[PDB]
């Protein structure tokens, strides 16, 4: 038939703002025709890894629903977006399954986010009581407690704030520059 009704992928990859990693943004995709060849063969990408399906196998197969997840992280922490990896971002912020079927994409966004003089728009979570379940999320900002003693509503010796800022600056190191990461999941039921 005459191909029409393409998917809104451009609304995701090209956007005004991107959510923080500990509050990663999620969108559902269904009843549209996607063209993964454009994304794979675009020249503006830096890390393109697919798990479970080859780039042409993406164009071959069809699936029920698609999920798109968006966040922003620093350079050295892009390695953590893969099954069976360790690190604070993976352990306490965002976790992938051990049998993941999808694709992981990351590209540099130095000019877009590293405004002159420093930025404070993005945050990540530093402490938690237990490891994150697959695709589990949390937004509550209760005062983290270490130790047996009860913690009041005031920061102190073993009462800590569970969030921290990224000090992005255009004059930073090679690995501290920002990176935008998109994770695509395909489920067939």
């Amino acid at each position: 038939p005459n191909i029409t009704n393409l998917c809104p992928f451009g609304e995701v990859f090209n956007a005004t703002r991107f959510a923080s990693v500990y509050a990663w943004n999620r969108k559902r995709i269904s009843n549209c025709v996607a063209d993964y060849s454009v994304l794979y063969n675009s020249a503006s990408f830096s890390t393109f890894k697919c798990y479970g399906v080859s780039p042409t196998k993406l164009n071959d197969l069809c699936f029920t629903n698609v999920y798109a997840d968006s966040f922003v992280i620093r350079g050295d922490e892009v390695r953590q977006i893969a099954p069976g990896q360790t690190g604070k971002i993976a352990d306490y912020n965002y976790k992938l399954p051990d049998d993941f079927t999808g694709c992981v994409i990351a590209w540099n966004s130095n000019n877009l986010d590293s405004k002159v003089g420093g930025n404070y728009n993005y945050l990540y979570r530093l402490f938690r009581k237990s490891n994150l379940k697959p695709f589990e999320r949390d937004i509550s900002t209760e005062i983290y407690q270490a130790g047996s003693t009860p913690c009041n509503g005031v920061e102190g010796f073993n009462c800590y704030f569970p969030l921290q800022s990224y000090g992005f600056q255009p004059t930073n190191g090679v690995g501290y520059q920002p990176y935008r990461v998109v994770v695509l999941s395909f489920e067939l039921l």
Partner: antibody, heavy 122, light 110 residues
């Protein structure tokens, strides 16, 4: 084994600046916190500042606010303190104190104590 | 002005070996979340942690050391002081900035 080992002696001319390190081993240093204490010969003890390792957020006494810089380096697990505008009153011995914590939590008290590094102002 | 100023009651204290003794460390306000601890120091040595929270005993601290306290008033007791137990003592508060020490106290054998 849990230990906190310091660099040792330092001798500086008056009016200069001095720097001290202490190196920590045997515990999850990413969760603990460090406190700096200074002692003069038979002159009790003097608290000056404390830092949280995970964030680097530091707090200083007013008397030592403009003269003391507290820094950490997580990759080598080192604590650094720098004092500027050295005076004759600065001939003393310095201590860094920190607890031991597993990943989950802390002992709610300071028990890992260093050995002490002497700073002399000639 | 300073937030909290501590005070140790006993001065130079002299005791016969094994004689029970008590020290007190009081303050102007109530320390937030009961943060007082005791440290023990010796000449040519670094301090060691004795008791945190005025009640809890640290690893390696014998049964002969005891403490208690609440609000403005805390106390420490030692019944059978061994000759090695005679040293200088200090009490610290770390509830609210800025944390402060006491004036110390010396214990000697009579």
């Amino acid at each position: 084994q849990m230990q906190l080992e310091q660099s040792g002696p330092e001798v500086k001319k008056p009016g200069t600046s001095v720097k001290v390190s202490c190196k920590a081993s045997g515990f999850t240093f990413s969760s603990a916190a460090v406190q700096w204490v200074r002692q003069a010969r038979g002159q009790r003890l003097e608290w000056m500042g404390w830092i949280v390792v995970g964030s680097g957020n530091a707090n200083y006494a007013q008397k030592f606010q403009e003269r003391v810089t507290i820094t950490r380096d997580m990759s080598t697990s080192i604590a650094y303190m720098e004092l500027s505008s050295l005076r004759s009153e600065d001939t003393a011995v310095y201590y860094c104190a920190a607890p031991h914590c597993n990943r989950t939590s802390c002992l709610d008290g300071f028990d890992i104590w260093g050995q002490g590094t002497m700073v002399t102002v000639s | 002005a300073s937030e909290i100023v501590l005070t140790q009651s006993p001065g130079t204290l002299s005791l016969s070996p094994g004689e029970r003794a008590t020290l007190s460390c009081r303050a102007s306000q109530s320390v937030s979340r009961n943060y007082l601890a005791w440290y023990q120091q010796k000449p040519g040595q670094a301090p060691r942690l004795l008791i945190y929270g005025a009640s809890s005993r640290a690893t390696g601290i014998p049964d002969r050391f005891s403490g208690s306290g609440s609000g403005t008033d805390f106390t420490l007791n030692i019944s059978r002081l061994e000759p090695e137990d005679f040293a200088v003592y200090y009490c610290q508060q770390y509830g609210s900035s800025p944390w402060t020490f006491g004036q110390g106290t010396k214990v000697d054998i009579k």
